[PDB]
Amino acid sequence: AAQTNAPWGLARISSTSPGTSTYYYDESAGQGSCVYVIDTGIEASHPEFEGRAQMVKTYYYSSRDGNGHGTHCAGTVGSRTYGVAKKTQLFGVKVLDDNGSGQYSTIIAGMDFVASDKNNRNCPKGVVASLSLGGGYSSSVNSAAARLQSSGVMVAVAAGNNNADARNYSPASEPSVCTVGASDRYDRRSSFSNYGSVLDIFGPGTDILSTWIGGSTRSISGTSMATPHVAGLAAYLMTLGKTTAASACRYIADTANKGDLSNIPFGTVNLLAYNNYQA
Template sequence: MLSAATLLLLPLALAAPTQPPEETFIVKMKDGLIKAEAVNGVLSSLGVDPRFTYEHAFSGFAATLKPDMVKTLLANPDIEFVEKDGKVSIYETQSGADWGLARLSSQKPNATTYSYDDSAGEGTCAFILDTGIDASNEEFEGRAKFLANFADKDDTDGHGHGTHVAGTIGSKTYGVAKKASLFGVKVLDAQGSGDNSAVIKGMDLIAKEASKQKCPKGIVVNMSLGGSKSASVNAAAARIVQAGLFLAVAAGNDGADASRYSPASEPLACTVGATTRTDTLAKYSNTGSIVDVLAPGSNITSTWLNSKTKSISGTSMASPHVAGIAAYFLGTGQKVEGLCEYIAKQALKQSVTGVPKDTVNLLIHNGYQKGSDRS
């Protein structure tokens, strides 16, 4: 993040005397301004065309700027900050086998049945910021829609990661909330990578479009992606939650402190670490005090492209378990306010081994009592 006080910290390349490079920056306007007018005024004064404009996640834009333009923006009292665009990617690791869904309704590991209330997230909507979604997959039963693309020119899931995540949230066989409506917002390309500016545009769209969908029981958002800590990504994530949506985010796969990553470091998001089928913290999972809950993440089987399935691992797989259980709880009548705390309250305590002292030992559980089991 850049401010007038930190201008001297800009890379030396920005001060090159000949043909200074142009780079993409994310610009956030101060709150309280008339959004469209403020953004348009700044863009007009710079004489640039934006890559994206933001109105709902926050007021601002992303554009390719020369160093002198950055200096001009830093001197503008209407600008809160200017941040260089950064890279984000999926949090996926190796392949394996299935077990995670049954763990959500069992008191012990190695269960083979998933028991749940048959409301199953009906009346809820899940927005998935990812590589897209293969909405034609029969596992989605017509409840899935590819909503928008900010990553490339291919309006399909060219990778499979987004379809896998969506399947964990709400597919008929592998989903936690089997009756939820699913909306894919593509912000990552076929290699599973993208830019902060595109991710923020995806959040901006969700903040705008969510209320237009038929979601009487509530809305959840999942972000199984991340990159280095970013003030702009965190600001947009916070606004999503403040707008009344539940946001689950992956903690990250570097075995490091999740507070160094975004959106994992945003306090208002529900940040999720990953466990294995033996109730051990996954070695790759990021940790730290910012993590809210733990969820199955290793060797998770879910939907894939062309109506196939695949087993993959990562905090990318843990986060949609939490988004799914959030939709499930909303479907039973819980409110979105305080929902991450409610999920933590329902979780199994001290059941995971290998958890460091600065990280919660809370393994998510749906709290379902057997009697009219579904599986």
């Protein structure tokens, strides 16, 4: 399939070179998989989700996304226009409030909640989680990531946005999950993206057009935005039978576009998520 004049980052994870605007992908498009966006929620009523999104948990007085961050991330995962896995089922877990913040213990609760809830959902092709959030190193927050992964969810986490080594941030530093740095449409590392040997992969993170609340769409930037490209890609690959939730971070690394980013420090992978669909 092909979706012309696509946001640059969808084109980019289906291209070997930068500077193209069509997204080439297999039409199964993540059918039969499930992605949990653990964030500020999802405006499920957005036309762009087409009935494929459901809040299923909020730790606040309301489950609605009143911030837009979660809605944006979820759109990159699985909205019809702006998404990677255009036919996956989305599930929202509101751990962050509407200013986008949230206490560690609420975040850990939401994570353990996915390890369990997945057993209340039909996700025969695989289950992913996407965590576009992070704060300073915590053994506990990391351990909640690891539990989620161990239970058989592909966990994708933002590496952070301070320009540092991500080894000091959580859940980014945790080893056993898939820590996602950011890039721009000219294959530069995004100027805010964290780096460091704990990263597994880069995806598109600078000027990422996706959904917003009110039914609306904006471009924003962040490792938040890079993270749901890798989650959605993991869903797409599960569905195609290429990989599994426990194997998907390694499969994505193995099949990435290797050398191609500039602005990589020494010691950080130079790997760019690729769907290996057009070539």
